Amino acid sequence: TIEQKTRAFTVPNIPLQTLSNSRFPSLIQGMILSPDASQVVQFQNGRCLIDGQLLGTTPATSGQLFRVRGKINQGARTLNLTEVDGKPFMAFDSPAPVGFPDFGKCDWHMRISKTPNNTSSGDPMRSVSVQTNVQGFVPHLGSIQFDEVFNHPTGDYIGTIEWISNPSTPPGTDINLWEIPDYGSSLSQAANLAPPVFPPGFGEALVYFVSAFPGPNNRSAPNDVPCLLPQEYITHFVSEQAPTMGDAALLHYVDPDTNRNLGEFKLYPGGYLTCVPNGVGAGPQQLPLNGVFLFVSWVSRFYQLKPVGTA
Amino acid sequence: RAFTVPNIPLQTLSNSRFPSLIQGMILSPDASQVVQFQNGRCLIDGQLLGTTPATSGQLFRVRGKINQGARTLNLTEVDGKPFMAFDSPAPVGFPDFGKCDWHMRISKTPNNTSSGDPMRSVSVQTNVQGFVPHLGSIQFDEVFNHPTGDYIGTIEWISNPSTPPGTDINLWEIPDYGSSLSQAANLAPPVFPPGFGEALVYFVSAFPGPNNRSAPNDVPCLLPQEYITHFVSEQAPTMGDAALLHYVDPDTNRNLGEFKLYPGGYLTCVPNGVGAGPQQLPLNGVFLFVSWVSRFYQLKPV
Numbered sequence A: 001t002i003e004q005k006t007r008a009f010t011v012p013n014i015p016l017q018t019l020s021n022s023r024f025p026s027l028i029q030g031m032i033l034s035p036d037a038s039q040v041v042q043f044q045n046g047r048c049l050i051d052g053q054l055l056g057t058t059p060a061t062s063g064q065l066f067r068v069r070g071k072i073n074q075g076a077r078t079l080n081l082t083e084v085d086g087k088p089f090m091a092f093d094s095p096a097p098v099g100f101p102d103f104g105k106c107d108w109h110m111r112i113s114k115t116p117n118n119t120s121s122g123d124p125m126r127s128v129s130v131q132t133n134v135q136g137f138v139p140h141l142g143s144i145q146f147d148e149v150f151n152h153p154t155g156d157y158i159g160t161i162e163w164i165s166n167p168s169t170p171p172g173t174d175i176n177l178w179e180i181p182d183y184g185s186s187l188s189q190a191a192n193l194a195p196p197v198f199p200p201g202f203g204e205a206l207v208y209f210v211s212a213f214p215g216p217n218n219r220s221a222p223n224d225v226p227c228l229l230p231q232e233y234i235t236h237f238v239s240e241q242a243p244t245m246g247d248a249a250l251l252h253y254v255d256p257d258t259n260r261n262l263g264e265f266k267l268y269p270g271g272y273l274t275c276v277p278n279g280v281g282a283g284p285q286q287l288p289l290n291g292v293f294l295f296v297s298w299v300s301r302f303y304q305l306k307p308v309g310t311a
Numbered sequence B: 001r002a003f004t005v006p007n008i009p010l011q012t013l014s015n016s017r018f019p020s021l022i023q024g025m026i027l028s029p030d031a032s033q034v035v036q037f038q039n040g041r042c043l044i045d046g047q048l049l050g051t052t053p054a055t056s057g058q059l060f061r062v063r064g065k066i067n068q069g070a071r072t073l074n075l076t077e078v079d080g081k082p083f084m085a086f087d088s089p090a091p092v093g094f095p096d097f098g099k100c101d102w103h104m105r106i107s108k109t110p111n112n113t114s115s116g117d118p119m120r121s122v123s124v125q126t127n128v129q130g131f132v133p134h135l136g137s138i139q140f141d142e143v144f145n146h147p148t149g150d151y152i153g154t155i156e157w158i159s160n161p162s163t164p165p166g167t168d169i170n171l172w173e174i175p176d177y178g179s180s181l182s183q184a185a186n187l188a189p190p191v192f193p194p195g196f197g198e199a200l201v202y203f204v205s206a207f208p209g210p211n212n213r214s215a216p217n218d219v220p221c222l223l224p225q226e227y228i229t230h231f232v233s234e235q236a237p238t239m240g241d242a243a244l245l246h247y248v249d250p251d252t253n254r255n256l257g258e259f260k261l262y263p264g265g266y267l268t269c270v271p272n273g274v275g276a277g278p279q280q281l282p283l284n285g286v287f288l289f290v291s292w293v294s295r296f297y298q299l300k301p302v
């Protein structure tokens, strides 16, 4: 319809501290730049074009996000993946089931249970671990491998990653949440992976939203999980499907108390935000978390942003 | 601002009492069922009630401080900000699962170590003297012989309440937020059956744990969480007694049923006798706002 093709672009009118990470369900705790200025990312969750087109394994909502479901035989180590709702995973069409975790360079410590409940007593929860750099980690081929033999009843199991730690192999490897796992194998590459996102250059830098995920690391610091878009943005774009009318959407990060602009950002149609750091050490990490991004105007990709933060 | 609801299929939307996809749309088994959920409560002009969070990120989490050797978790908000006692039933997003024991998994935050499994299992009874979230604290079943600190987590599975004996899980109920000397302030009010041919619609999702029926633990809620987020963001003024919605098949554009969304944040329909109701409908439909209507607007039976 005319209304559909002329629908004005909008973003959710909710402060950042109230929005959610799109790589796992949790409130956003901060904005950062990548420590390495040359960092290329290829996250498979939290990927959505601003006209509402989902990419990779990205779910429309938080409900499928960061869940794992599959069938496993008693005495086996192989979890044969399905979609979160139990329907078959059509492999070769996607890197993994919708919402499947994209945490690379770490051991996964999972909690799962047999579904649906058919018990009248007892604790249903089971702890399993998954290494992602072993030959058995082939979600694109429809399966992942647990570390130990699964001595529990054959059936349909659902759960999630509860905490993460350094990869078991090779020794001395630290967690790196900037990376995704290898979804395929040596004989078969992962098909329909969401594309990489490169640093924009020319004074601009990618902005990442971070939330702490449980687990230790070599720095004795939180495992901060970076993502490109709040999940609420993704849901909003999927619902609205507003046509993209320019090269980039100019956003102002506005202080709700004073109505003053705290920072200028560009939201690119590919579903990521950039800013211009105001010198070395400056960036969006210096901004308070109670601001609201407001859509100002469609702009050219060449439009220059006022630098953000203080050196 | 014109009123709208999200353009997303129901099966893709989330429960507002815990983060999970909606798996069903039902009437209460008891037609006289009164509910008083504290989560999933939002006026349709975007005003949150009870303990309801604006978004899923805050929903169904518990955070607080606990000392090594103690049983008491002194609650904060999910982001770590102080919780004000006597003001509300519990911190925003605090679970509202009544009539069950809670089996939780929690961990000390932020991480400050290079080694070890951080996860701790604790259990909470909600009908005991020590369950006083309105006063800012809850009591674990056992002494917490783990490091002192700031802990965050959630309920992992539920089971029958420990007391009194022979009590089964009833997720239609909420816990007793109050104390021996003080009732909980600012509880979201009860929602009563509408009568006059109409019935409340509930969205259900299964939660882990055993029960006496050896079947799923079904959690009913009044609104999808995404609707709540949408209303909070949009702040569209309520301009009639009820918002008439059509539940539409997106593949064919066929209207599958008429519903009324009331200002208080709940949906009704008219069942076409016994056996009829919204549970007969496919879950891939999208609700669409049609018009503001009066309270006495007669819905076509579903």
Ligand SMILES: CC(=O)N[C@H]1[C@H](Oc2ccc([N+](=O)[O-])cc2)O[C@H](CO)[C@@H](O[C@@H]2O[C@@H](C)[C@@H](O)[C@@H](O)[C@@H]2O)[C@@H]1O[C@@H]1O[C@H](CO)[C@H](O)[C@H](O)[C@H]1O[C@@H]1O[C@@H](C)[C@@H](O)[C@@H](O)[C@@H]1O
Binding pocket: A120, A121, A122, A123, B101, B103, B123, B159, B160, B161, B162, B210, B211
């Ligand atoms: C404290 C505990 O573990 N209670 C168990 C109970 O345990 C024992 C019974 C007898 C001895 N003994 O010989 O000396 C030792 C331990 O075992 C019963 C029967 O299996 C458990 O009740 C059953 O499972 C529950 C999950 C419920 O489905 C219940 O209806 C079943 O009958 C009992 O578990 C506790 O039951 C309580 C209700 O009566 C309540 O639900 C409580 O939360 C349950 O405790 C949890 O589940 C246990 C299996 C265990 O994991 C415990 O740590 C949990 O808190």
Ligand SMILES: CC(=O)N[C@H]1[C@H](Oc2ccc([N+](=O)[O-])cc2)O[C@H](CO)[C@@H](O[C@@H]2O[C@@H](C)[C@@H](O)[C@@H](O)[C@@H]2O)[C@@H]1O[C@@H]1O[C@H](CO)[C@H](O)[C@H](O)[C@H]1O[C@@H]1O[C@@H](C)[C@@H](O)[C@@H](O)[C@@H]1O
Binding pocket: A107, A109, A129, A165, A166, A167, A168, A216, A217, B114, B115, B116, B117
């Ligand atoms: C298999 C295992 O449990 N490995 C542990 C290791 O455990 C033992 C040490 C010594 C004996 N013994 O003398 O007989 C027996 C068992 O203990 C080290 C610490 O000394 C653990 O490594 C440390 O904690 C990890 C969580 C990481 O942060 C790591 O960097 C720390 O050094 C080690 O845990 C395993 O470390 C692996 C990396 O080297 C990898 O991260 C793996 O996932 C870890 O195993 C998990 O965490 C354990 C604590 C345990 O809960 C296990 O079940 C998990 O899979």
Ligand code: NA
Binding pocket: A132, A134, A135, A136, A137, A138, A182, A183, A184, A185
């Ligand atoms: Na692989």
Ligand code: NA
Binding pocket: B126, B127, B128, B129, B130, B131, B132, B133, B176, B177, B178, B179
């Ligand atoms: Na109480």
